[PDB]
């Protein structure tokens, strides 16, 4: 079934494209004189392709071979039990990421209402699916039929300015991949106008996606050399406390620095001198004494 209805791309067939349908799109989106398309019609042929796979998935129901039931729950889970145990460790990465790309944001938003509805997926009647739906009939008459679905609960998020759907491909990757030292983060920090500790957060994922896109092994110690200042503190913050873990706001000190306390730190910076640029952006500028060097490098035993 999977090969017949999911991988057989030729077996997929899109709604017929008439001349009026064609000219519409070529004057609609390739030439989008009328810019936007925000509606629900049989057009754009791309959501439908993923939809056709999706709708084929929804129609699927685990059952006998005596009837039009395509596959048996035993045979189904057998296929997974067969293929899961055939998964390459890298395939686990794609799976583990898939479990979190889709399922985890669903199972987080779940209540008692959805319990009956979850079983309809695996077509696996467990305790009671007839009497319980009337309990859901109670909440659903007092609940919008659109929101109570599981598919729609995540339709909105924050910060549509930088989206994950576009930032997969690392920007400027052709340049900073050639000689990574030539590109300290302060060069690409401006490329992301988000909060700083956030911009240096996403910059890690940019490096890790960049490497995998080129199959090379990713620099596992970039974040530590990236969040150097962050790292050197906690290593100390750990070696003062009796707790093991990261530093939350609570255990941070309660000092009240004056309004002008870093002035000497400023006229230092506002009057710094650097012979070659790399000196200015060196990754070990943070490291002044041995007490620093011992901690920063205390990670890599090597």
């Amino acid at each position: 079934w999977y090969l017949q209805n999911v991988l057989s791309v030729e077996l997929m067939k899109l709604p017929g494209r008439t001349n009026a349908e064609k000219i519409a799109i070529y004057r609609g989106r390739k030439r989008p004189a009328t810019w936007d398309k925000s509606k629900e019609g049989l057009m754009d042929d791309e959501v439908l392709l993923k939809q056709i796979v999706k709708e084929r998935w929804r129609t699927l129901e685990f059952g006998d071979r005596d009837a039009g039931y395509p596959c048996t729950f035993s045979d189904y889970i057998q296929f997974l039990n067969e293929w899961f145990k055939s998964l390459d460790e890298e395939g686990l990465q794609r799976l583990r990421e898939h479990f979190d790309r889709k399922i985890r944001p669903l199972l987080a938003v779940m209540t008692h209402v959805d319990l009956m509805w979850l079983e309809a997926l695996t077509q696996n009647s467990v305790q009671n699916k007839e009497q319980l739906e009337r309990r859901i009939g109670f909440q659903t008459s007092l609940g919008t039929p659109e929101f109570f679905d599981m598919s729609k609960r995540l339709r909105y998020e924050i910060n549509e300015d930088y989206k994950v759907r576009d930032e997969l491909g690392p920007e400027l990757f052709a340049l900073w991949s050639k000689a990574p030292e030539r590109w300290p983060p302060e060069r690409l920090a401006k490329m992301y106008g988000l909060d700083f500790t956030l911009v240096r957060k996403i910059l890690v994922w940019h490096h890790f996606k960049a490497c995998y896109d080129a199959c090379v092994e990713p620099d596992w110690t970039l974040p530590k050399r990236l969040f150097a200042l962050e790292w050197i503190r906690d290593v100390r913050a750990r070696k003062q406390g009796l707790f093991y873990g990261k530093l939350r706001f609570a255990e941070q000190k309660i000092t009240f620095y004056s309004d002008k306390f870093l002035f000497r730190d400023l006229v230092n910076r506002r009057e710094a001198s650097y012979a070659n640029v790399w000196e200015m952006d060196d990754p070990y500028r943070f490291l002044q004494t041995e007490q620093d060097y011992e901690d920063y490098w205390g990670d890599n035993y090597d």
Binding site: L14, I25, E146, D166, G169, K178, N300, Y301, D302
Partner: protein, 334 residues
């Protein structure tokens, strides 16, 4: 390469989208010679040997030799030698003064005041559209849209949306009543209908001291001026009862011009106020001449003299530019 492309699926017609940065589609070879390619093949191979084998065996990690932290020594794409990165770069094509002097001349143009921005045209304050589930049921154009339907179209082919059948009756609900349902609409409405840009007085519309539209002064201003044109007022008088589709035929012979080219200019000039086309400028000239010198007869010397755009002559428009929709509702009576 020689033969034709085709879609494996039946009836696939829209291009699949590829984005910049996606390594699937990058062709940026700036320091990628053959040696770097083979040097790139090096790091790629010793990490994922199954990626290259036609039939890949199950890929797994074995012990690494130099040490557990061997990613330090192998990670990252191979490096190009440093000097080529610095001096191996073409000279930047010289951007002369005029290439700038014209751009800075091309940038100062876009700083002009576009009329639709300060006091937003009504057509664009109620043209808001959201894919949200709540938005469309309270069809938002209902008020102005009905007017445009009514007087700018015939009674047979105009869809008029009634107000009472609307969700809230089509007006703002009383404030403290509806759980915040209605308040967000007008708020959202105002958030799309608030102006911006340096108005006539010289400040933002949201300025703390300069407030325009005091007691509908600008509203009473347009109400007494009237969005019209002396040149139109003369022509539409001279046309009289006849339809342009009849009048135009007379004006343009078999080989003078394309009446469509002309008659179209009359439609967006008689109504939907704009400047009349150079074609229309000439056509109106032979036609309107006898009207002007009857119009412009008793004028004193210093006053401007009405004449088509082509001894002080200045067209009969006191409006620099009227929006295409307000000129309509005025001139929907003519």
């Amino acid at each position: 390469k020689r033969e034709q492309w085709a879609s494996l699926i039946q009836g696939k017609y829209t291009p699949k989208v590829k984005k910049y940065g996606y390594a699937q589609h990058t062709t940026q070879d700036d320091f990628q010679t053959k040696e770097y390619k083979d040097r790139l093949l090096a790091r790629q191979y010793f990490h994922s040997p199954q990626a290259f084998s036609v039939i890949p065996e199950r890929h797994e990690r074995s012990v690494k030799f130099m040490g557990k932290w061997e990613h330090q020594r192998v990670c990252g794409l191979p490096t190009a030698d440093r000097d080529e990165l610095e001096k191996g770069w073409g000279e930047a094509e010289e951007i002369s003064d005029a290439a700038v002097g014209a751009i800075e001349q091309a940038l100062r143009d876009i700083s002009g005041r576009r009329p639709g921005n300060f006091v937003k045209s009504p057509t664009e304050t109620q043209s808001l559209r959201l894919n949200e589930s709540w938005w469309t049921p309270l069809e938002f154009g209902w008020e102005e849209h009905n007017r445009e339907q009514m007087a700018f179209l015939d009674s047979s082919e105009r869809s008029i949306v009634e107000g009472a059948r609307l969700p809230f009756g089509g007006k703002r609900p009383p404030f403290g009543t509806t759980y915040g349902m209605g308040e967000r609409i007008s708020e959202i409405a105002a958030d799309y209908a608030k102006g911006f840009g340096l108005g006539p007085h010289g400040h933002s519309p949201q300025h703390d001291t300069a407030h325009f539209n005091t007691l509908e002064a600008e509203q009473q201003r347009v109400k007494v001026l009237g969005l019209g044109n002396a040149l139109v007022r003369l022509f539409h008088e001279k046309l009289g009862n006849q339809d342009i589709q009849a009048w135009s035929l007379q004006q343009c012979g078999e080989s003078d011009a394309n009446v469509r080219q002309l008659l179209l200019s009359v439609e967006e000039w008689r109504t939907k106020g704009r400047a009349p086309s150079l074609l229309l400028r000439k056509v109106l000239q032979r036609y309107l001449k006898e009207e002007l010198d009857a119009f412009n007869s008793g004028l004193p010397a210093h006053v401007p003299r009405l004449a088509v755009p082509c001894g002080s002559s200045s067209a009969g428009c006191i409006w620099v530019d009227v929006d295409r929709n307000a000129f309509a509702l005025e001139h929907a009576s003519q």
